[PDB]
Design an enzyme around this catalytic site. Structure first.
Site, short mmCIF file in Angstrom:
data_model
loop_
_atom_site.label_atom_id
_atom_site.label_comp_id
_atom_site.label_asym_id
_atom_site.label_seq_id
_atom_site.Cartn_x
_atom_site.Cartn_y
_atom_site.Cartn_z
N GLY A 14 0.66 -0.93 -0.16
CA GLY A 14 -0.07 -0.02 -0.20
C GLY A 14 0.58 1.00 0.02
O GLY A 14 2.38 1.50 0.29
N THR A 15 -0.31 2.77 -0.33
CA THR A 15 0.63 3.74 -0.09
C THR A 15 0.97 4.46 1.42
O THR A 15 1.28 3.20 2.04
CB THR A 15 -0.36 4.72 -0.25
OG1 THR A 15 -0.80 5.06 -0.11
CG2 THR A 15 -0.46 4.43 -2.15
N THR A 16 2.44 5.26 1.38
CA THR A 16 2.81 5.56 2.48
C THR A 16 2.40 6.21 2.83
O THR A 16 1.14 7.22 3.37
CB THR A 16 4.09 5.81 2.14
OG1 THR A 16 4.99 5.59 1.63
CG2 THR A 16 5.22 6.27 3.87
N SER A 62 -2.66 1.89 6.26
CA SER A 62 -1.99 1.60 4.23
C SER A 62 -2.39 -0.04 4.66
O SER A 62 -2.66 -0.54 5.01
CB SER A 62 -0.53 1.27 4.37
OG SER A 62 -0.04 3.00 4.52
#
Ligand SMILES: [Cl-]
Lengths: 111, 235, 250, 243, 244, 241, 195, 231, 240
Positions: free
Chosen positions: D29-31, D74
């Site tokens: 996932g994204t930060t 995330s």
């Protein structure tokens, strides 16, 4: 003891013409000897060229109208936007009322 | 083993796809919609000569204005028919009117995907639902176990379906009469059936606005079969 | 969530064997030796207090348990399974008998109830069988003294004397030679200590051995006086000192 | 083998491989980050702009619980939403019974026990999210981070997602260089920088910065989104530092 | 999920057999032999205890023969624990019938009820079947003396003479040879013991390895008596018939 | 080989899922120790904060179950907190129903019974933790009772749990072999804590700072954990003799 | 409904039951048959609250007919009466009890004996030589006490029954519109068409 | 492979294959396009037929006077989800006298779909939805995926060959967003967008399905000769 | 509850559990049904592997569902009892709610519906039973004979057989039974039913059961001697 019913007064009148119909009602809302409102609409346009008025106990009357308006909405969804005929609306309202045979909507209804 | 409601890598429900294979093994059923009415015809396919063929009930009345033919695991259709009849008459109770053919079909198709781990598997039967209402006129629907239903001008289901459907592709036009449709169902049934077609191993039916849904007598069908033979021998 | 294991985990194999019961019996075989001997005027049940660590207080772990005032139990196999069975056995003696008839159940019927619980764990959904064999000693007015064995399957048998667990085969042979129908309780205790010494490796004393008896009524252990018909429990757990005294005359 | 096919099964190691596979979805996932400051907390997240067709500032990722708690995560976004919905039910029932708003440590355990419950059975899947959350209560500011296993601890700074290592390194510098502490407005600036620095791991697509904060002085201990001039000021500070 | 670990106890084989029922029958074939013989003036139930010990308390022991009511008894072959579950249910059913109609339950009705319970475990619930076969010995005023058997499939049948458990093939052949319709109880007792003595896997048939029972109209006037034989009484009948 | 996935018997009569739950117990790589004084029960545990970003005040494996009962856990924190919450609920329910404070040994038994159910019922997994309950019981005095994933529990004179439990266990065994008593003959709990720390140092062969340890102390009518400064004072006294 | 009588003679059981059915102030029917055949040799008459009577009787009838088919065997009058009693005793503690009183007249083919059972709505069963429900017994039992013998013929039983109905017709305020009489014996159940 | 037997199982790389297979069903489905301006929002859908005798499967469903969607994938699943939206839109009206916000409608769909991806026994929904609506904050367009992911967009497309229409909208972004107070021109842009996804077949009278909602425009569907204007 | 889907479709579109239930029927003893002009006869095989049997008390193969309808079967014996019980309960339930006894067609449709329900319900397996249901409708003199099977399909038959070696006896019936002129009397109907079983049975002793059902609830089961006379007459004519 709690009395779930009340009487909001008012009177309604429906007359059928040859190619038209009227549904009339006074706009006064009351409890006992007091006036709640001098203008509280009682007759409603429910869609599909149908008008309705549930007179007696306003809380039950508003609930019934609200439910029938909802029945019209779902009739369109379920049956391809077909127009609800007046005879079909009448039969539908019978079942709405009898659903509370043992705790009645305290209203005299006219469409 | 594996879930009953499992998706395949291609994005299809295994069980639904497998039920379609069962329908391919079923006896042929054909429907043709015209402006004079909708005709429904079926292959009876008796497993033995001692089996009284008139007890084979693969064409069924749902309401006075709606009929139904079936193909596949025909035992699965009984609960679907029961639901359809109940839905049709219940709507008449609530709304004091006939129910739309599409709405009836949609009610039947809502049962389809009610399976999991509700019933344990999808239905193993396809239905041809034919009828008439004031809004959309004469209609023919094909109800599958996927929950999907397509409207058709003409449709064949069962073992000889793709061969019959190709034949219906050429023969159907918008100006067909009821009599022409009757002979056309008999013609295509006779083509795809294993045994020789007669009044005992094949059944006709129709739905008209005036007379409603009617299953044809064996005497009435026999004349239409004789009328078919003569017109094919005419050229 | 929900317990979705509504199906049996014990099933018949092609040979007719119930695998999980057999495997439960194998767990019982690995367990520490326990035994029971029936005398004319009493019953004795005994086992080794196999302490897991010397820092552990082995007195707090009770392998021999009171079920009713006149019924006691010991086991071989999985200790935790035994502990919960004792809890259920104590309760079922009240719910399915004492609260109905106003008296404690006879040995055979309490055994029957315990047996039922163990059978159900062999057939019900989402459970394994109990990994213990029980030896239940008891007394009641109309049947006298009795000793019963209960296995993981739920099957139970009455014994004059027997042993279960690690060295049961050798222990049962030892008991067959020594047992007779004229044994007094003290003679049975003596034989129990002799039999148990063979299966024990390390220390053999009152602190490493657990032993209880079903014998005469103990009015001193009743806790009250005034009712003649109430004469006290027949179950008594022997103390560390009481065991050591009998090990000198061994 | 076969120990990794079913949730709640211990491998011979004593590991729950299904929970470890859920961590892989988190790492994908994204930060997202969290920073504890003098009198509150700051949350920030990386939103990947997959396409120009995405409406800016509309697909909001950070979620509020009650009125004093912020939650960011995330991994699988729906799993995070499910967890926050539960968190809101937990916070509501706490306030209903006890009157006072739920303390952050109390709230943290409510999420922890719920996530941990999804590692006890094979009939459920573990959560595919690591959740950073916190806020201000009667005892002051608290920042937490919660993993798929149900494991959580208190943090000075927290980071998760694809750019977590880069973020963690930056957070560690702030802790060393500011033992006396960091202000709320500073933390917002630093949060922006760290997300920008952490974006090097997702450098293919451009991104949108989203920040929120709870502070006793700056927001009266309520959760608020950083908007307008204060957001742009943080973006400018972040853009200046990368160049 | 849980599906992975389900053995599926209630399914058909490709040949149309119930796996678990067949395997339960395999279990029962290793159980101690039980024999039932019906005569004109009574019924005999004989059964062999499995490899006993000298330290087993026999006089208080019961693994084979159980009393359902005053008129009906059963011989067990299979898992004793499973049998006791069913026996207690049958005892209740008989009492329910007596309370309802104020008459003792007809034998077949009780047998059908237990057999229906067994059947249920083979068709639904996902549980293992009861690894038990019963021989029912009973009396009522409709059909008189009756022998039945039920097995884990839930199928039951009536018999003049029958065996369950181990060596039923050999035992049934011996019974079929020496049985006659005009036979009496004292003769049937002898036939039962002689059949066990020849089919047994043990070296010799002794009193301590047997359970025995009779249902006789040999009770004072028009009534029926159940006799569960004591260890000493089994020892006497073994000497009388000339086996020991 | 599905007998190794759920809690059913293997052919050897073993429960592999229970055995693997025991192995999860040492996943934290933390060692705990418990000893009894005259008037008190002390429990110490190693504290390891590897990440600088962590708030060290929140990193703990010691729990205050009730006013009287303390609990240290050996195993992963999610299962530890699961057990902690249940023990707190059980301790509170007990007091409400039966009108007195739940004893340490009774709570241990209750938690042990719950653990037993997980070894028998298939749908529930065992918790990968060893729970050590400590108190000064009003009837039994200083008490240490320890539960494991098998559903086993027993009382202890002293005990140790963790990867290096054997080294600590033998060290304690050797001390009680000399003194020939079931406890630490000491008046103040401060000196009992000093004993506990000293003997962990000797057994493990490592020195400790104030942040390397975590201490719980049970006295009559209360259980409490020591702060870092309280532990520092303890470490100073050890070094000065 | 109103009046139901029963008498057990030498070789048969005779049940007499009124024909009237009243709603409000109007007699709707004067030919009502207040009885159901439970089995070929077992007849049950009934009286009580409106609607409940027939529903209960038909429910009992269905259960006995089910038993007959399942076992291919007719239950004894005693067994049927016990089944009926239990249903009424079960009913009296229900949310809404069935307010029904019954007489069960049967011929036991095994014992070759007629049997009459009186059961009220509470589940109170008694075997009797003659019986009645409600106020019927107040007028008739004195006649039956006087004239009844156990060795009476069926014809003598009918004559004594006529005397009972005549007394009811004289001293009861209510008009019950005569009775339908049915005889239960070894050959089965038959109706006396002229009474 | 071994981790695609049910929805409750992560793969070793942290993937949910049953969800991905459900996503595959959408790609097999017929193309549908969604786009909006500041005043109006438009759905355009290419309907699919079984054969020449069959009708063209309906793609667009009305949820309320101010909201509706288009579908791509399993049609019965769209019927279930649209029915749920109809109920939620209706609950908001009856209880709060409030038209349901399009953003909140997306949140409800996300949460409903999510429950099917985490529990044993059930299955993910096998359909993608494009929701359009006009509420108190203007026109809106949402894209629903059965993974649970819901996204607010200016324009988008889903189904077979949807990448062509999506690229077109990505170029036209600055143009069609400015089409305010002009429904016909906004529909034209949608019809031109969906045309980029066509191969072999072209837009006929019973093939094309269009829907629109706006400031003073209730959600209305156009089929048959009503869309001949735009062909 | 146990909800496991046991009856499911396979890739080739078959429900194996339903098909394996038919194999259980194939194993069962032979049952035959023949309808004459004014009667129906139900014949049933009794396997002679089981002697020392008490024929008084052993469950008979033909079962009365009501006074005017009977049911025979082939397959699992225990399974058949459950269908018979349900059928008997429905028969009384119909009389109670509609005041008419069930038609033979209705009763068949109910039993067939039960069998079908067990092919798409969770946690249950199909009935390993096929039934022959025969009788006369109330106030009707036309004979009725129906067949059901595990899948739940049913149909009417002039004559039909089920069970082991049913293929052989069906072969016999197909060439011997004339539709234009069915067995006019009871004798001819029974004779044809016995003849058909003699193709398969083995010995004509106690292996054949016959049950004659006539209109107006006239049902009787033939005895051993009565059947033995048919067996004697058939073979004496055959010796030519
Ligand atoms: Cl407990």
């Amino acid at each position: 003891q709690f009395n779930p019913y009340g009487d909001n007064g008012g009177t309604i009148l429906g007359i059928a013409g040859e190619d038209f119909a009227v549904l009339a009602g006074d706009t006064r809302n009351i409890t006992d000897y007091s006036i709640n409102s001098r203008y509280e609409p009682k007759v409603f346009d429910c869609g599909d060229n149908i008008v309705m008025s549930a007179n007696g106990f306003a809380a039950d009357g508003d609930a019934l109208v609200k439910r029938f308006k909802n029945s019209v909405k779902w009739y369109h969804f379920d049956h391809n936007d077909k127009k609800l005929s007046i005879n079909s609306a009448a039969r539908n309202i019978q079942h709405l009322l009898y659903s509370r045979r043992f705790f009645p909507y305290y209203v005299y209804n006219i469409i | 083993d594996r879930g009953v409601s499992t998706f395949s890598p291609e994005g299809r429900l295994f069980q639904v796809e497998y039920s379609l294979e069962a329908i391919k093994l079923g006896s042929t059923a054909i429907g043709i919609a015209t402006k004079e009415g909708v005709v429904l015809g079926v292959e009876k396919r008796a497993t033995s000569p001692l089996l009284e063929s008139d007890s084979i009930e693969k064409i069924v009345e749902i309401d006075r204005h709606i009929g139904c033919a079936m193909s596949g695991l025909t035992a699965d259709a009984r609960s679907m028919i029961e639901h359809a009849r109940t839905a049709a008459v219940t709507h008449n109770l609530y709304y004091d009117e006939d129910i739309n053919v599409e709405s009836l079909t949609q009610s039947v198709c809502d049962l389809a995907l009610r399976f999991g781990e509700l019933m344990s598997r999808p239905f193993g039967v396809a239905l041809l639902i034919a009828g008439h209402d004031a809004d959309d006129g004469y209609q023919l629907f094909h109800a599958e176990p996927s929950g999907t239903f397509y409207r058709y001008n003409a449709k064949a289901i069962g073992s000889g379906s793709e061969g019959a459907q190709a034949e219906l592709l050429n023969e159907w036009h918008s100006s067909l009469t009821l009599k022409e449709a009757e002979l056309l169902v008999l013609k295509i049934l006779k083509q795809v059936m294993e045994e020789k077609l007669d009044e005992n191993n094949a059944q006709l039916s129709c739905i008209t606005k005036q007379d409603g849904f009617k299953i044809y007598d064996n005497e009435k069908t026999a004349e239409l079969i004789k009328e078919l033979k003569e017109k094919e021998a005419a050229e | 969530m929900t317990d979705r294991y509504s199906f049996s985990l014990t099933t018949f194999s092609p040979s007719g064997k119930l695998g999980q019961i057999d495997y439960a019996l194998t767990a019982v075989k690995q367990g520490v030796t326990s035994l029971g001997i029936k005398a004319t005027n009493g019953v004795v049940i005994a086992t080794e207090k196999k302490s897991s660590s010397p820092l552990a207080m082995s007195e707090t772990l009770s392998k021999v348990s009171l079920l009713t005032p006149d019924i006691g139990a010991v086991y071989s196999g999985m200790g935790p399974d035994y502990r919960v069975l004792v809890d259920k056995s104590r309760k079922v003696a009240h719910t399915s008998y004492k609260r109905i008839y106003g008296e404690y159940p006879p040995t055979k019927l309490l055994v029957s109830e315990v047996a039922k619980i163990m059978q159900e764990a062999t057939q019900s959904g989402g459970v394994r069988p109990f990994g213990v064999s029980l030896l239940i000693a008891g007394h009641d007015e109309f049947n006298g003294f009795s000793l019963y064995q209960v296995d993981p399957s739920g099957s139970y048998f009455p014994w004059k004397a027997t042993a279960i667990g690690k060295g049961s085969v050798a222990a049962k042979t030892f008991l067959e030679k020594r047992w007779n129908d004229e044994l007094e309780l003290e003679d049975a205790i003596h034989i129990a200590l002799l039999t148990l010494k063979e299966s024990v490796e390390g220390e053999f004393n009152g602190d490493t051995i657990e032993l209880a008896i079903i014998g005469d009524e103990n009015p001193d252990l009743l806790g009250y006086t005034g009712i003649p018909t109430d004469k006290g429990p027949r179950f008594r757990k022997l103390t560390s000192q009481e065991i050591n005294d009998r090990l000198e005359a061994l | 083998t076969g120990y990794d096919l079913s949730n709640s099964v211990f491998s011979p190691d004593g590991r729950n491989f299904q929970v470890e596979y859920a961590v892989k979805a988190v790492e994908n996932g994204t930060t997202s980050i969290g920073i504890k400051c003098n009198d509150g907390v700051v949350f920030a997240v990386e939103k990947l702009i997959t396409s120009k067709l995405l409406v800016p500032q509309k697909n909001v990722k950070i979620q509020v619980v009650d009125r004093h708690i912020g939650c960011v995560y995330s991994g699988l976004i729906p799993d995070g939403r499910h967890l926050v919905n539960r968190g809101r039910e937990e916070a509501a029932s706490f306030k209903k019974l006890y009157k006072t708003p739920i303390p952050i440590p109390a709230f943290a355990d409510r999420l922890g026990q719920y996530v941990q419950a999804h590692t006890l059975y094979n009939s459920v899947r573990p959560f595919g999210v690591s959740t950073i959350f916190g806020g201000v209560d009667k005892n002051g500011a608290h920042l937490y981070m919660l993993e798929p296993s149900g494991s959580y601890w208190g943090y000075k700074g927290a980071a998760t997602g694809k750019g977590r290592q880069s973020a963690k390194a930056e957070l560690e510098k702030l802790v060393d260089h500011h033992p006396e502490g960091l202000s709320a407005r500073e933390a917002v600036k630093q949060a922006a920088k760290i997300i920008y620095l952490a974006h090097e791991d997702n450098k293919e697509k451009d991104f949108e910065l989203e920040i929120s904060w709870c502070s006793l002085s700056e927001t009266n201990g309520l959760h608020k989104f950083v908007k307008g001039d204060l957001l742009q000021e943080a973006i400018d500070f972040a853009q200046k530092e990368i160049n | 999920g849980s599906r992975r670990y389900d053995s599926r106890t209630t399914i058909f084989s490709p040949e149309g057999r119930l796996y678990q029922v067949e395997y339960a029958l395999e279990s029962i074939s290793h159980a101690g032999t039980a024999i039932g013989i019906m005569a004109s003036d009574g019924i005999v139930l004989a059964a062999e205890r499995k490899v006993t010990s000298t330290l087993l308390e026999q006089d208080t022991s019961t693994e084979k023969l159980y009393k359902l009511n005053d008129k009906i008894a059963v011989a067990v072959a299979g898992l004793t624990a499973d049998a006791e579950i069913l026996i207690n249910t049958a005892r209740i059913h008989a009492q329910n019938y007596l309370k309802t109609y104020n008459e003792d339950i007809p034998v077949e009705i009780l047998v059908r009820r237990l057999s229906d319970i067994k059947q249920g475990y083979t068709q639904h619930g996902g549980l293992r079947p009861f690894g038990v076969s019963f021989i029912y010995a009973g009396y009522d005023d409709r059909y008189g003396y009756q022998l039945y058997t039920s097995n884990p499939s839930g199928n039951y049948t009536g018999w003049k003479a029958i065996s369950v458990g181990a060596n039923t093939s050999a035992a049934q052949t011996l019974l079929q040879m020496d049985y006659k319709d005009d036979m009496k109880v004292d003769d049937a007792i002898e036939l039962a013991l002689k059949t066990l003595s020849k089919t047994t896997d043990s070296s010799a048939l002794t009193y301590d390895r047997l359970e025995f029972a009779t249902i006789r109209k040999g009770a004072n006037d028009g009534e029926v008596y159940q006799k569960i034989f004591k260890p000493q009484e089994i020892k006497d009948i073994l000497v009388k018939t000339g086996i020991t | 080989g599905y007998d190794r996935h759920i809690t059913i018997f293997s052919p050897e009569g073993r429960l592999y899922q229970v055995e693997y739950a025991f192995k999860a117990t040492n996943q934290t790589n933390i060692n705990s120790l418990a000893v009894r004084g005259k008037d008190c029960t002390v429990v110490i545990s190693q504290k390891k904060v590897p990440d600088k970003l962590l708030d060290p005040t929140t990193v703990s494996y010691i729990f205050c179950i009730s006013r009287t009962i303390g609990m240290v856990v050996n195993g992963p924190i999610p299962d530890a907190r699961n057990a902690a919450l249940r023990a707190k609920a059980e301790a509170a329910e007990f007091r409400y129903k039966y009108g007195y404070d739940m004893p340490c040994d009774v709570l241990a038994k209750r938690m042990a019974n719950l653990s037993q159910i997980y070894t028998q019922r298939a749908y529930m997994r065992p918790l990968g933790v060893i729970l050590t309950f400590v108190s000064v019981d009003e009837e039994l005095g200083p008490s240490i009772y320890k539960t494991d994933p098998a559903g086993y529990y027993v009382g202890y004179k002293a005990t140790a749990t963790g990867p290096k439990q054997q080294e600590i266990t033998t060290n304690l065994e050797n001390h009680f072999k000399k003194s020939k008593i079931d406890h630490i003959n000491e008046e103040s709990w401060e000196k009992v804590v000093e004993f506990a720390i000293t003997h962990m140092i000797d057994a493990l062969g490592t020195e400790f700072s104030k942040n390397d340890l975590e201490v719980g102390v049970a006295t009559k009518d209360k259980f409490f954990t020591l702060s870092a400064e309280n532990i520092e004072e303890r470490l100073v006294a050890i070094a000065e003799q | 409904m109103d009046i139901i009588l029963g008498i057990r003679v030498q070789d048969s059981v005779i049940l007499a039951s009124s024909k009237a059915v009243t709603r409000g102030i109007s007699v709707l029917k004067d030919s009502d048959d207040k009885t159901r055949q439970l089995s070929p040799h077992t007849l049950m008459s009934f009286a009580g609250e409106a609607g409940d009577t027939v529903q209960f009787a038909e429910y009992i009838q269905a259960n006995i007919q089910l038993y007959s088919i399942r076992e291919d065997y007719e239950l004894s009058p005693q067994a049927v009466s016990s089944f009926v009693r239990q249903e009424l005793a079960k009913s009296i503690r229900s949310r809404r009890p069935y307010q029904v009183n019954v007489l069960i007249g049967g011929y036991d083919k095994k014992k070759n004996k007629p049997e009459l059972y009186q059961i009220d709505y509470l589940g109170t069963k008694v075997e009797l030589p003659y019986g009645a429900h409600g106020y019927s017994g107040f007028y008739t039992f004195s006649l039956l006490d006087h004239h009844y013998r156990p060795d009476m013929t069926t014809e003598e039983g009918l004559d004594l029954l006529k005397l009972c109905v005549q007394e009811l017709e004289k001293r009861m305020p209510m008009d019950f519109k005569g009775v339908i009489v049915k005889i239960v014996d070894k050959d089965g159940i038959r109706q006396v068409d002229d009474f | 492979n071994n981790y695609d037997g049910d929805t409750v199982t992560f793969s070793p790389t942290g993937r949910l294959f049953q969800v991905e297979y459900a996503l595959e069903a959408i790609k097999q489905g017929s193309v549908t396009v969604g786009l909006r301006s500041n005043t109006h929002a438009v759905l355009v859908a290419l309907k699919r037929n079984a054969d020449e005798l069959s009708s063209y499967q309906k793609k667009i469903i009305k949820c309320d006077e101010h909201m509706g969607l288009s579908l791509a994938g399993l049609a019965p699943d769209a019927r279930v989800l649209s029915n749920y939206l109809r109920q939620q839109c209706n609950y908001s009206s009856l209880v709060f006298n409030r038209k349901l916000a399009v953003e909140r409608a997306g949140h409800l769909l996300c949460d409903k779909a999510q429950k099917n991806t985490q529990s044993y026994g059930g299955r993910p929904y096998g359909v993608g939805l494009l929701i359009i609506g006009y509420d108190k904050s203007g026109a809106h367009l949402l894209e629903f995926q059965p993974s649970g992911n819901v996204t607010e967009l200016y324009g988008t497309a889903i189904g077979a060959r949807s990448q062509g229409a999506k690229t077109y909208l990505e170029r036209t972004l600055d143009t069609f967003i400015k089409i305010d107070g002009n429904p016909d021109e906004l529909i034209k842009a949608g019809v031109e967008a969906i045309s980029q996804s066509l191969r072999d077949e072209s837009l006929t009278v019973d093939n094309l399905s269009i829907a629109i909602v706006g400031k003073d425009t209730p959600f209305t569907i156009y089929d048959g000769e009503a869309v001949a204007k735009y062909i | 509850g146990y909800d496991r889907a046991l009856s499911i479709f396979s890739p080739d579109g078959h429900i194996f559990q339903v098909e394996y239930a038919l194999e259980a029927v194939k194993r069962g003893t032979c049952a035959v049904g023949v309808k004459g002009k004014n009667c129906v006869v139900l014949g049933c095989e009794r396997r002679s592997t089981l002697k020392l049997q008490d024929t008084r008390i052993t469950p008979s193969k033909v079962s009365k569902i009501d006074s005017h309808v009977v049911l025979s079967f082939s397959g699992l014996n225990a399974d058949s009892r459950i269908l018979i019980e349900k059928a008997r309960v429905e028969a009384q339930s119909h009389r109670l709610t509609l005041e008419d006894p069930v038609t033979v067609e209705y009763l068949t449709r109910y039993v067939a519906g039960v069998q079908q329900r067990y092919t798409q319900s969770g946690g249950v397996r199909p009935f390993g039973v096929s039934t022959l249901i025969a009788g006369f409708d109330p106030r009707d003199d036309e004979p009725k004979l129906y067949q059901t099977e595990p899948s739940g399909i049913y149909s009417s038959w002039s004559a039909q057989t089920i069970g082991r070696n049913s293929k052989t006896v069906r072969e016999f019936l197909e060439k011997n039974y004339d539709r234009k002129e069915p067995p006019a009397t009871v004798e001819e109907c029974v004779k044809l039913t016995v003849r058909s079983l003699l193709e398969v049975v083995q010995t004509g002793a106690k292996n054949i059961e016959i049950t004659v059902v006539k209109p107006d609830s006239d049902i009787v089961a033939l005895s051993s001697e009565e059947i033995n006379q048919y067996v004697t007459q058939i073979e004496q004519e055959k010796q030519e």
